Design a protein around this ligand. Structure first.
Ligand SMILES: Nc1ncnc2c1ncn2[C@@H]1O[C@H](CO)[C@@H](O)[C@H]1O
Lengths: 115, 112
């Protein structure tokens, strides 16, 4: 509206506060309010895409940008020992907000399997 | 490159291939952690996501779109989880960038 009225769309439009790490014209990185690792943040597109399963072919650059921004933010946040990037899709993926997001978790040893 | 994923790309050792194009390969993981568990990897040898170049941005997105399409082809209509591991804390097992896609069961939180 632009960004939609999911909570993530509201965050994009500064209508709900968030702890922002990085912002550009395509995406926003901000900390997760329910962290599952010592560092846990999200990278979201400003364009509303509900879930990765409905992303268009022409969304490739944008999706890749989420990953590049995620890795840059992880470096800026000092995650020199590594981290895990996660995209949850739908019910089995554990998706809770239908605005696609890349989660980045680090600052501890991550285990296998990844859930 | 110089990892087992390079050997798989070069067809030197076998893998159950799901999809291929000029720039990536998708194949079932040898150690599956879900009823469906596959990888999408670039043919370009990027060792880890932390060293990916800005110019690789659309290639990385291509891995995700290919992962989405393969998931649908493999019947993952209830959802799935995509994972990229970086470094030792991330549990990265092979130093060749890979996007893992897992589904066919409920995935749990935290994701490791
Ligand atoms: N207002 C919010 N600010 C930051 N993260 C959020 C917010 N609401 C939900 N999340 C996080 O989004 C993730 C998936 O929707 C979860 O890890 C959850 O904690």
């Amino acid at each position: 509206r632009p960004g939609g009225d999911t909570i993530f769309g509201k965050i994009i439009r500064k209508e709900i506060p968030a702890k922002i790490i990085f912002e550009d014209d395509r995406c926003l990185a901000f900390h997760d309010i329910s962290p599952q690792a010592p560092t846990h943040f999200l990278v979201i597109p400003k364009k509303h895409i509900s879930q990765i399963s409905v992303a268009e072919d022409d969304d490739e650059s944008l999706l890749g940008h989420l990953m590049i921004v995620g890795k840059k933010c992880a470096a800026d946040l000092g995650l020199n020992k590594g981290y895990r990037m996660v995209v949850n899709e739908g019910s089995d993926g554990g998706q809770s907000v239908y605005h696609v997001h890349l989660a980045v978790l680090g600052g501890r040893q991550m285990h296998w399997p990844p859930g």
